[PDB]
Symmetry: D2
């Protein structure tokens, strides 16, 4: 077979740290690490049937004289420019290894936040000396040219303002802002730029990191990745997207409506091009019809104005600075943010647990947000997660019930995603993994 | 007034160096060059727009401070001058000072060398990786997207970019390369922009240019290009790009340059095939079939253009050592004084151009170069535009076979919108072919 | 109190890592004492502490990480009212290492991996660095001729682009580094590393000079010993007292093990002309007790600084290739065999010093291991607070064994007393913490 | 010949810049060769140092990465284990850089502007840097106690983040930089600057130590002197011979200009305890010749290295405010008034020494400027090759004047002789190059 060697950015490892990543009987670790490493070599589509395409891929970790070398059997050939692996992709492979190893060397509420902290610290993601300048960007993996161009323009304007970018991984509004920021930073001579990509193992093949990401972090699960986003964020920019972006929006809004979070200054701007006005009218209406009028104080909307969204982020930075100091908190990690256990407790989407969601309009707005967060994660899981497609493939779409006022508003929004092509990367038509009862 | 202080890269200057820049001809050139870099975003009626602008060089405790009176407001993001634009201001000041503190063939080349070395543009220990990118300032979106794609592909191969200044193909590649370099983790990227005082207002440097150099004239800029180049990529363009093409092919056809390995790739999107078929034909119709060994054409393949440059870099390395030459400056390349002698285009000197097909191909190249620079001057240079206001178009004559071909090519530039950036009135020719 | 604030290399810390270091806490007292030792960079007792009873240190987790509030710090840590920047760095190194050890008390394999873990966490193990680390060993209490000699050897190491790993304190612990500061400056070696390894029970007796740019605090004497020999690419030993003899018997015992026969690392004993009779007596000590087979592991180089350094320098490619052959790291010698008689933590007290097997019918490695322990007791009785307390209320440590081994040891200990190697010379004469039966 | 190649910090050069230092332009090569030889020779203080290395030559080669130098039979003490000390390598390119600049750029304003231009080309004038440069003057030939003192002051300057500008050579020219290497390392001052200024006629007598990281070759003595005082933010003067007296008389003659009365730069004369009588005598010589008015411009500090360094350090904010007040550079003191008598190059032969006006009925600034030239001639007659050649065939330089002055100068020179300051002790005994009438 074809064998490539990869040389190292990264620490020495012990035999203890590394023996767990041998192909072995009655452990799942190697295949987790292999799949994550495979995904990184594949920056095509959004299904996890790419594991069927590269079934003869394998990876070996070697402890040698200058640290770790990796040997790749049959890697995807589009990792390669002129027979050599793009240096960014090389670095992602070591980020994979670093984070898988950390987490497995380190197997309630304080415990979870502390683990999220530890992972991020081990990754080098929390820079002690840094002034607040980190903007989390959220938006669709499946987006048209006009929306993509708009994300690039916003990225550009953040770049000019010496701001850094944290996103998820994948195509669309996950790579657009970094590409624009590449230009904006170079205009502004900002050499210390950071493009942070946060992923987890069940999502990573579906949405592989761009090699422009210069700090990849693999979180253990979706909820810990979401906690990482909101604890590192200094501002939040939200683009148009499908159910993944909705999940992320409802996560932060459930958090922000807590009374303890009322002096948390973190700006959220929903932003899009002129043609996303109808998307944003519909989305704003959904939020206020479900979570109440109270939610609207936590965000603002900017249509057709990249510089404004980025100006808002930029202007808010001294606010974030002052507030961290008032709380005796760190700049780089928001300890003082109150996240309730209903946002922290891992949700494994199957038919049973999708049914058992209390999606009724007589809850606390926070707990309802926590529930719809879970709802939208199940939609994601049924679409893109290899385990989650299997449960649809044997037992049909996930069954979902509640207040019919909410249920019909949810179904309209979900169908909007289908109609605007937000569910899937386009190339046959989408069939729901969901069923609203 | 609106008064901005800019602090500094920039060396200390003496009183002797500074005194000459006090607000006769030297202040104006310096002011106008500095106005140009503040106005990033193709005529020189941009002087009228900011008539109340002034600049003061102050010698202070840590070096040079600059005071701007009424600078253009699009240099500013949120009340602060873009840092790249600040660096351009000091690059302007560096180069005006150097040229004025110093000022045949060996004299001219050593001046060109000295300017570049003073600018820090000649990095002694660097391996060959510099691609010169030529192309139109006035190009469509498909052509523009193509330039940024090639730039991307050059970034991924760890190659650097030298270009002229301005919009269009002058900014595209750099912007693609920003992404490509970032993916490739290439932190030591170099985006060289070369300009001269007579064109800088019409074609201002993008703030993404991180090495701006100002040459004293067009001919010394063209020499700077070809002595620094390790390869050349040429996109579709107008008369300025044609000038540069004919400059290089003229040079490359000299027998003493037969061992010069420098690759030249003419490249463009699918839709540019007719452009290149027509341009390639013009080239072999004028210079001969002997011209074709000095370039190739790569249509609709950005990776191929960049692979050709990348593959050539060890060959450039070996050739420079074979000649006992520098990596960063090609001293060994032969430039005859017909390519070096500064051409001042006016009504008189345009009509006195010798443009006949009964000529040595290198002399015809050097003469066609002057013709196309003439067109450029009448379109973009303030003194050129003023001369067409006063006297009408530059007249050109010669072999009527050559005259028909030139006219067709010029007419192609007009019809493909290559003469003039959109949004004014229609282009009217600054040339008339007799 | 005189509050001096020390501003923040040093990572963000959680509250959980930090809370045990409040004044109530045996951990705080340890942290305080290490921090004060570091602030007190001209005697070798730990009634050093009793000069500074009103000293305390508060850790504050703030916006850019840890700040330190010092209450009444030693005033020779200051130059014109500002704390020396090297001492500031040492304060954070202390914090880092005490935190790391305390967060990791969860068995030969456990010892080595902890030592690996501490060093890697400290930044002491550089991936990608080729072998250039010389461990320098010698007495803390030496004369000017001996001192200038270590400084000359230091200069010769520096010219050859070699780095220095040593213990902390005065005398031969600072000499080499001061010499190498000149040597490295001539050679333009800006990436110089001067490593100082210590542990909490000895740090107050032998405080790190500010010139040490990589201070590491190991949890005990034995783990410092392992760190020395796992990191060393060469070893230079100057004349010294019981501490230097302990270290010498540590390494000779390791290197005589038959599994360690291929290990290429040089050991050079070296001193000025006047130290010939010191080495004549110590070479005789070693060969009478351990064997003629001990002698093949070290050489002796009197009065040639450039030759000691040259032996180190010429050994580097040999050490380089050997590590490659073993698929071993350059920076950490995993393959070296350290048997558990060199790892087992020895708490010197009256009972344990009595139980030592010093009989000349042993395996020569195990005799080396017991002589190691014997010499650590002498050190502990002299300069360590808890060993001083044992000596105060029970009298001197009592050792027995083969009567002409014991007469050779009594002679060698008496040489140390005569040469003022036991203790930096105070008003009263040295009284032995040891009696040989 | 043994050919050693030196690879290229330093620019590309043209054929035109290089052609002139081909061996045949004929004068220029021999000057360039001698400067490069001196640099490789970092033993004694004659200029029969060129007679030992008659087969040495140097060839400049324009190559692919800039300049390569081919050394034919270089001195072996430029080498450590068969490789040239990188400090010395950098020194060869400094020589080349400066020889080229001066000879490509061939009254009062033009001399200052060339001094400036040389310094700026060398990289010696740093934009953005605040005042921290201490000029150190002192003997080339000094005992161990005076040497150790200079190292201690150097250390104390180092601890205060001050940089050092000095002459080249042994003695008080190397002492401070070696102490500072340690003091800068304690304070983590990695951006340390050790400037050594020299000129072609003195370089072989007094070669740079490889510890000097910024070597500048000036075209003559007077231009070196101007470079010192224009860059200085403070001045320390140790005991020394005629060359240090020369520099003392330079600075004191400058500082007694009424236009210089506001210049805040401190001058501290400093020495070990045993040099008290030396300073007693020199203080008397200065106040007798120049007046009580000379004494307000310096102080004497005996046996306190820290106080000498403290005076320098505390004066920096005063120097800073003053350069702001005169709208002058931090790095280069344009505003300092230097009269042409201090600028005008003196060439010591027998006629110019005899034509010196040396009469105690003078303007103190005129008398200082003349005594400057007198001492320069003693230095030239001692160490300069063309100076020694004048006395080898016409006998000692003759000086005459006010017989009170002439006996004071006689006594001071005889003190230099008695204290071994004229010549490094261990050749033949010193025979005076001067006769006082």
């Amino acid at each position: 077979s074809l064998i490539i060697q990869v040389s190292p950015s990264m620490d020495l490892l012990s035999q203890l740290e590394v023996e767990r990543l041998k192909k072995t009987a009655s452990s799942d670790l190697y295949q987790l690490y292999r799949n994550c490493s495979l995904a990184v070599l594949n920056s095509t589509d959004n299904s996890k049937e790419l594991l069927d395409k590269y079934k003869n891929f394998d990876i070996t970790v070697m402890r040698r004289e200058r640290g770790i070398k990796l040997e790749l059997a049959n890697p995807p050939e589009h990792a390669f420019v002129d027979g050599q692996i793009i240096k960014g992709i090389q670095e992602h492979l070591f980020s994979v290894l670093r984070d898988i190893v950390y987490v497995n060397m380190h197997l309630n509420a304080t415990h979870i936040t502390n683990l999220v902290f530890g992972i991020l610290r081990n990754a080098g993601a929390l820079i002690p000396g840094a002034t607040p300048n980190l903007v989390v960007c959220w938006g669709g993996h499946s987006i048209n040219e006009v929306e993509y161009q708009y994300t690039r323009e916003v990225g550009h304007e953040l770049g000019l303002r010496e701001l850094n970018i944290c996103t998820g991984c994948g195509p669309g509004a996950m790579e657009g802002p970094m590409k624009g920021a590449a230009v904006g930073h170079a205009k502004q001579r900002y050499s210390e730029y950071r493009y942070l990509g946060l992923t987890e193992p069940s999502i990573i093949a579906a949405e592989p990191p761009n090699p422009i990401v210069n700090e990849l972090v693999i979180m253990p699960d979706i909820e810990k990745r979401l906690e990482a986003f909101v604890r590192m964020a200094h501002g939040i920019i939200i683009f148009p997207g499908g159910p993944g972006t909705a999940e992320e929006l409802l996560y932060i809004l459930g958090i922000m409506m807590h009374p303890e979070n009322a002096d948390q200054p973190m700006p959220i701007v929903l932003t899009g091009p002129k043609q996303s006005e109808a998307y944003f009218r519909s989305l704003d209406k959904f939020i206020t019809d479900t979570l109440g009028e109270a939610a609207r104080k936590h965000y603002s909307i900017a249509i057709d104005n990249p510089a404004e969204a980025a100006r808002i982020m930029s202007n808010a930075m001294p606010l974030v600075r002052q507030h961290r100091k008032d709380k005796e908190d760190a700049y780089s990690f928001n300890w003082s943010l109150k996240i309730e256990p209903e946002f922290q407790l891992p949700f494994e989407p199957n038919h049973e647990s999708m049914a058992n969601l209390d999606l009724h309009l007589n809850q606390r707005p926070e707990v309802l947000a926590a529930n719809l967060r879970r709802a939208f994660s199940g939609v994601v899981a049924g679409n893109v997660k290899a385990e989650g497609i299997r449960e649809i493939e044997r037992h049909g779409p996930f069954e979902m019930h509640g207040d019919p006022v909410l249920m019909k508003k949810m179904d309209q929004l979900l169908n909007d995603f289908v109609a605007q092509n937000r569910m899937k990367l386009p190339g046959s038509a989408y069939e729901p993994c969901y069923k609203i009862v």
